[PDB]
Structures are given as C-alpha cells and as structure tokens.
Amino acid sequence: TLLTAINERQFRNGAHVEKIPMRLLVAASNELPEADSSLEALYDRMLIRLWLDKVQDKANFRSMLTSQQDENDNPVPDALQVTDEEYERWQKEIGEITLPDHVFELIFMLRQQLDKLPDAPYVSDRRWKKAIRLLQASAFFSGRSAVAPVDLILLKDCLWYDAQSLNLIQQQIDVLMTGHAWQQQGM
Amino acid sequence: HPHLLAERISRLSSSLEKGLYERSHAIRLCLLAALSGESVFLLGPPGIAKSLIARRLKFAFQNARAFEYLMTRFSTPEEVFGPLSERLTSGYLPEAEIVFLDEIWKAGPAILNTLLTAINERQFRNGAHVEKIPMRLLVAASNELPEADSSLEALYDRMLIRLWLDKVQDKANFRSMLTSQQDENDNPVPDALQVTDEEYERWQKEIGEITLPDHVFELIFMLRQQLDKLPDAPYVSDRRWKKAIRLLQASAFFSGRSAVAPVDLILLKDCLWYDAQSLNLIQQQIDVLMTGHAWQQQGMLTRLGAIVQRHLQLQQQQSDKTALTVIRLGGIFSRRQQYQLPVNVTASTLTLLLQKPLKLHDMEVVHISFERSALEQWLSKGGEIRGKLNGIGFAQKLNLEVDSAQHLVVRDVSLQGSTLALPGSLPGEIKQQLEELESDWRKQHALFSEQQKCLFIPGDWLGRIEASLQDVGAQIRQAQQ
Numbered sequence: 001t002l003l004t005a006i007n008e009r010q011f012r013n014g015a016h017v018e019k020i021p022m023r024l025l026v027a028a029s030n031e032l033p034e035a036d037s038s039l040e041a042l043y044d045r046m047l048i049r050l051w052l053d054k055v056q057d058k059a060n061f062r063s064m065l066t067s068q069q070d071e072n073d074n075p076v077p078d079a080l081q082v083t084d085e086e087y088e089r090w091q092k093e094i095g096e097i098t099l100p101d102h103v104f105e106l107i108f109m110l111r112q113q114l115d116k117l118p119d120a121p122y123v124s125d126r127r128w129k130k131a132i133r134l135l136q137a138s139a140f141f142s143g144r145s146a147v148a149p150v151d152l153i154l155l156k157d158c159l160w161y162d163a164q165s166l167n168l169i170q171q172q173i174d175v176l177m178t179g180h181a182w183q184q185q186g187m
Numbered sequence: 188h189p190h191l192l193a194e195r196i197s198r199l200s201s202s203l204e205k206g207l208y209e210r211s212h213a214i215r216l217c218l219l220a221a222l223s224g225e226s227v228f229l230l231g232p233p234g235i236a237k238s239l240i241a242r243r244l245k246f247a248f249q250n251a252r253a254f255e256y257l258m259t260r261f262s263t264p265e266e267v268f269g270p271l272s273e274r275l276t277s278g279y280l281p282e283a284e285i286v287f288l289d290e291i292w293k294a295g296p297a298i299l300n301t302l303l304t305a306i307n308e309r310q311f312r313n314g315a316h317v318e319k320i321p322m323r324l325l326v327a328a329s330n331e332l333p334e335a336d337s338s339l340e341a342l343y344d345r346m347l348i349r350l351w352l353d354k355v356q357d358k359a360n361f362r363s364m365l366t367s368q369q370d371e372n373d374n375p376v377p378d379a380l381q382v383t384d385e386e387y388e389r390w391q392k393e394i395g396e397i398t399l400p401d402h403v404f405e406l407i408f409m410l411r412q413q414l415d416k417l418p419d420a421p422y423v424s425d426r427r428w429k430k431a432i433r434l435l436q437a438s439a440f441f442s443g444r445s446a447v448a449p450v451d452l453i454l455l456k457d458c459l460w461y462d463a464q465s466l467n468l469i470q471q472q473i474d475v476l477m478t479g480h481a482w483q484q485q486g487m488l489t490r491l492g493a494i495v496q497r498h499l500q501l502q503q504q505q506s507d508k509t510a511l512t513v514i515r516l517g518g519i520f521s522r523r524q525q526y527q528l529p530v531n532v533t534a535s536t537l538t539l540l541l542q543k544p545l546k547l548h549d550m551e552v553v554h555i556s557f558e559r560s561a562l563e564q565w566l567s568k569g570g571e572i573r574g575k576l577n578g579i580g581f582a583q584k585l586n587l588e589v590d591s592a593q594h595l596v597v598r599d600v601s602l603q604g605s606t607l608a609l610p611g612s613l614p615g616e617i618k619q620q621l622e623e624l625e626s627d628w629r630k631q632h633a634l635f636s637e638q639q640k641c642l643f644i645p646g647d648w649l650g651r652i653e654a655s656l657q658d659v660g661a662q663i664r665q666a667q668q
C-alpha cells in the first residue's frame with residue numbers, strides 16, 4: 001500500500017479512492033535491507049539517501065549539549081511560512097525549467113561511466129528521471145531559470161545505496177565536478 | 188470496413204507512446220494481447236517503466252480498472268484477491284480488466300494455484316458459487332528467472348509474449364526522456380480512439396475466424412521440427428503453438444487483412460524463448476526462415492542452381508563443334524614453348540569445358556576453370572599446373588599435357604584422355620526457365636510490399652527482409668548476361 005501512495009498519490013479507502021496530500025516522505029532506520037528481498041522496491045523509489053552520523057566538531061558539541069531551544073515549539077515566523085496556493089503553483093514551474101546542452105553532456109557522461117565499472121551501482125531510468133525534479137527545483141528556489149552545472153553535487157546522496165557504493169559515487173562525481181563541470185579537464 | 192480498422196489501431200498506439208521512448212515494441216505488443224485475451228511477460232532491471240505500461244493500457248477501454256501489487260515471499264491470498272468476511276473483492280482481481288503483478292517468481296503456493304484458474308477457466312472460487320473474471324490483459328514483470336525444476340514453471344509456460352526490456356541506449360532519445368513534462372497518471376488518449384465493451388466482445392469472435400493458408404502451415408511445421416533436432420533449442424509444447432495463433436491471427440485482423448500473413452512470424456521471437464541461452468537461438472532460427480523460406484528466398488536459390496547446371500550441361504554436350512587449337516612460336520629455346528590464343532581469349536579466370544567426363548579426386552567434373560597468369564608459364568617454361576574443379580575448391584594438380592594435334596589432354600588415375608574445349612559465344616530452354624523464375628521473384632516481392640505496414644512489426648527487421656529479397660534478384664540477373 002505504500003507504493004501506490006508515491007506514484008499514484010492515492011489510497012484504496014474501501015470502495016472509492018481519495019488523493020493523499022503527502023508533500024514529504026521521510027524514512028529512517030539503522031541497517032540495510034537484503035539484496036534479494038521485497039523491501040528493495042521502496043529503496044529504489046526513494047530519491048535522496050542521506051547517511052547521518054554523530055557530531056564530530058568540538059565547538060559544535062558544546063552549544064548542542066546545552067541548547068535551551070524547545071524541540072516541540074514553533075521557531076519559524078508566520079511571514080516565512082508558505083501557503084497551500086504557493087505549493088500548488090511551484091509544482092508547475094518546476095517542470096518548466098529549461099535543460100541546457102552543457103548539462104546534458106555531463107549527465108550522459110556520468111551515466112556511461114558507471115556502466116563500465118563492475119563495482120559501480122546500477123542507476124535505472126527512474127532514478128535519473130526523478131533526480132531532475134530535485135535539480136530543477138534547486139535552481140528555481142535560488143534565483144535561476146535554467147539548470148546550473150553546480151547542481152550535480154546533489155547526486156552524491158541519491159546514486160549510492162550501501163557502504164560500498166558510498167566511496168565510489170562520491171569519488172566519480174568529484175572527478176566530473178572538478179574536471180568536466182567547468183571545463184577544467186577540457187582545458 | 189476492414190481497411191479502416193488499421194487506421195484506428197495505428198492511431199491508438201501512437202497516443203500511448205507519448206512519454207515513453209524506446210518502448211514502441213512493448214506498447215504495440217501489450218495492445219494486441221489486451222484485445223485478444225492473451226498475456227505478456229516483462230523481464231529486466233527494476234526501473235525501465237515496467238509498471239507504467241500496465242496503467243497505460245487501461246486507458247484504451249471505456250471501463251477498465253487497474254491493479255498494481257508486488258508479490259512477496261510472505262504474501263497471502265487475502266491481500267490480492269480481497270479478504271473474506273462472501274469475499275470482499277471490491278477492486279482487486281476478479282473484477283479488474285488489467286492486473287499487474289511485480290516479481291512473480293517469489294509468491295506462495297496458494298496464490299500461484301489460484302492464478303492458473305483465472306487464465307484457463309477465467310473464473311474465481313468465491314467461496315460457494317463461481318463468477319467470471321473480465322481480465323483482458325495480464326502483465327507480469329520481475330528481474331530474475333525462475334528455477335528449472337520448480338513450481339513456478341507452470342505460470343511461465345502459460346505466458347505467451349515474453350519481452351526482455353532494458354534501459355535506453357540512444358543519446359537523442361535520452362534527452363527527451365530525461366526532460367518529459369507529460370504526466371504519467373493522466374489520460375493522453377482521446378475519447379474517439381477508446382474502444383467500448385461491445386467492440387471487445389465482437390472482436391473475440393472474428394479473431395478465430397481467420398483462415399489459415401497452406402503456405403503459412405508449411406512454415407510453422409518446419410520451425411517446430413527444426414527445434415526438435417537441436418539439443419540447445421528450447422522445447423515448445425502444444426500449448427505455446429496453439430496460443431501463438433491467437434496473437435498471429437489478431438495481428439492481421441487489426442492491420443486490414445483477412446488471412447494469416449507470412450510476415451506475422453516475426454512475433455514468435457518473443458514467445459519461444461525462455462532464458463538468456465534461448466534468446467540467441469530463437470532470434471537466429473527465425474531470422475533464417477524469415478529470410479529463406481518465408482518469401483521463397485531459399486526456395487528460389489536451389490532452383491536457380493538447377494538452371495545454371497542445365498546451362499553447363501548443354502554447353503559440354505555441344506563441345507564437338509568448337510575445339511581448342513594451340514598456336515606455336517619460334518625463337519631460340521631449349522624447350523618447346525607454346526602460345527595461347529591472342530584476342531580470342533582475354534579473361535583471367537576463364538573456364539574450359541571437356542568432352543568425355545572423368546573422375547578426378549573421387550568426384551565428377553564438367554568444367555575446369557584455369558588461370559591466365561599460370562597458363563602462360565606452363566605452356567612456355569613447363570613444370571606442373573594447378574586448377575580447381577567445377578569452379579569451386581582449391582587449385583588441385585592435374586595431369587595436363589600437350590597433344591599431337593595442338594590440344595590439351597587431361598588424364599586421371601586410369602590414363603584416360605580427354606580433349607579440352609572453350610565455350611562458344613543463350614539457348615531457348617535456359618531462357619524459358621529463367622523467365623519463369625524471374626516472374627516468381629516479382630510476385631513474391633509484391634506480397635512483401637503489401638503487408639510490411641503492420642504495426643506489430645519492428646522497424647529493424649524490415650532491413651533484413653528487403654536485403655534478402657534483393658540478393659535473389661541480383662543472382663538471377665547475372666545468369667542472363
């Protein structure tokens with residue numbers, strides 16, 4: 001039932017179906033699912049995959065250990081809160097972002113590079129198509145009208161899937177970001 | 188009326204391809220099975236639009252309900268066919284036109300047993316009384332292949348169409364796919380192209396009424412017997428052959444034809460295979476029959492050789508009129524040097540016939556093709572010479588020698604003499620048989636130019652049928668020179 005709420009955004013309520021206004025879906029755990037199980041369907045549909053950990057800086061640990069801010073309060077002012085009309089209007093302007101020819105040469109190069117390495121994780125067409133929706137919205141909320149080459153850094157938390165693919169995805173993207181992104185290696 | 192049906196089918200599948208690139212062979216194959224009562228199997232990695240094709244086929248009908256479900260290792264029949272109270276089957280499987288089951292190679296024994304009765308009997312055990320199921324299309328996708336000795340082989344043998352989908356490969360088709368603004372949950376099919384419930388029930392009766400020509404039966408029986416002799420060929424049972432006719436007869440009905448066309452045999456490349464080993468053998472065995480016995484390609488090649496053999500037989504029979512005189516030359520030399528004819532012969536790989544045939548290398552021959560570059564050295568310097576038999580094989584050594592009347596004598600193992608002769612400067616019998624064979628090539632090529640516009644035929648396969656028909660017409664035109 002969780003797969004139909006993401007693609008169709010509906011729910012089988014006995015007889016008639018109704019839409020679900022799900023704007024954000026977060027899933028946390030601790031371990032990784034099996035490589036040959038039924039739980040791989042939900043993992044392949046989740047776009048962003050973050051690997052959170054504990055704090056490491058000493059200066060950031062003192063202010064965190066003694067924080068008087070309530071976790072169940074409202075620390076966001078009313079002037080910065082978006083309305084329901086602004087959320088429905090932004091969904092139409094996200095897909096209207098133009099795709100420059102320079103950005104397409106970087107996506108096709110990174111996709112072909114992972115198909116040659118045996119230890120590289122397989123990226124399906126669903127992961128590539130859904131990554132554009134997050135990349136186009138990154139430039140829309142930043143003051144841009146087209147896809148910028150700097151938005152390719154967000155792919156480091158989407159292509160990976162386990163501990164072995166984390167060190168390979170962050171390494172292959174860093175080469176393209178410091179080589180073919182701004183014509184570094186081309187020059 | 189039958190000609191106008193091909194326009195509506197070609198326009199219906201065109202609207203279904205909006206937003207799905209490099210998936211033309213998957214949409215047209217699922218549309219034919221949805222209008223004929225068959226099934227379809229999809230194989231590939233998860234993430235190649237394997238679930239959108241199941242939700243897109245429900246838009247072609249006026250009243251069609253979709254059903255998406257993922258079969259797990261601990262799945263229960265109460266979650267697929269609806270739980271009981273007599274069974275709450277409101278929107279599940281017994282009352283669904285198109286059902287989608289992902290990863291079917293891992294379900295339970297209770298769900299697999301109930302799924303076999305919904306295809307053959309098209310019913311469901313609803314506690315006491317049974318009710319029919321209006322299932323018009325059944326699609327099953329996964330990622331891996333079932334075991335060779337397991338209970339999951341019963342459902343795989345019943346699935347007719349087996350497609351092996353993969354990711355995109357073209358660079359131009361990837362840019363438009365990566366940035367597609369078409370909604371996947373919308374309705375991109377107009378109301379004028381959507382079929383009704385009355386048209387679906389009427390087409391099921393006209394599918395079985397398609398006549399089976401005698402020329403098509405000779406191709407099905409030949410392909411079935413060819414797979415029974417190869418050990419690495421997949422076994423095709425009687426259920427697979429019988430169900431393949433329902434998809435072949437409906438392919439010509441929706442294209443403007445009343446009988447089974449030989450071009451419909453290309454659809455068997457996604458039904459006979461079952462694994463990675465049978466994929467390279469099924470596509471290869473069908474391509475030979477499609478470019479050999481489908482349009483009489485190989486049938487005319489063996490008939491053309493009989494005309495060439497008959498022309499060489501009549502030339503060696505009348506060889507007593509033209510002999511072979513070798514002129515002499517003067518000069519100062521220790522050996523008797525001989526010279527060939529000047530302008531009378533100018534070809535390099537010329538052929539020379541003979542009168543009485545002999546047995547050379549434990550085989551018969553009717554003409555020996557010599558080389559002009561090696562004949563000048565043997566007639567002057569001497570030594571040994573080589574030459575192939577019947578214009579084929581390697582240049583074998585022969586017992587060539589000169590005669591008292593300036594002629595060439597070829598001996599064998601019994602010291603039998605044979606005077607060689609050159610062919611003179613088209614008989615009426617050869618031209619009559621060549622004109623009849625050329626007329627059959629034009630009639631066979633006209634049939635391909637009237638049925639290649641089928642929607643259920645891939646585009647890359649048309650390049651091999653046209654290239655195979657042109658090779659036969661080019662070989663018959665060289666003999667009449």
Ligand SMILES: Nc1ncnc2c1ncn2[C@@H]1O[C@H](COP(=O)(O)OP(=O)(O)O)[C@@H](O)[C@H]1O
Pocket residue numbers: 125126129206207208209210232233234235236237238239354355364371
């Ligand atoms: N080859 C393709 N061509 C066009 N669109 C595709 C392709 N593969 C995937 N998509 C798009 O990705 C979206 C999600 O596909 P998904 O259902 O995850 O595929 P699968 O069922 O194979 O996992 C679909 O809406 C589809 O439009």
